[PDB]
């Protein structure tokens, strides 16, 4: 753990939980991530996210 300062090991882990929460919110806010996981048969209101 020596090649990075203990300021940096906390700032990576705080950004690891930070970007994870932003990418979850920004995928639900976006309409393009909503689609069907069943492309074989046609639509039966099966629009579903993955995140």
């Amino acid at each position: 753990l020596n090649p990075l300062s203990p300021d940096i090991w906390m700032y990576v882990l705080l950004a690891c939980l930070g970007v994870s929460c932003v990418l979850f919110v920004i995928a639900r806010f976006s309409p393009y991530e909503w689609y069907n996981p069943h492309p074989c048969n046609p639509d039966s209101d099966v629009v579903e996210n993955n995140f």
Binding site: R28, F29, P31, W34, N49
Partner: peptide
């Protein structure tokens, strides 16, 4: 029409 589907994606359950 944006206020229709903004609650569809703030569905809060799934």
């Amino acid at each position: 029409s944006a206020m229709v589907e903004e609650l569809r994606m703030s569905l809060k359950c799934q």
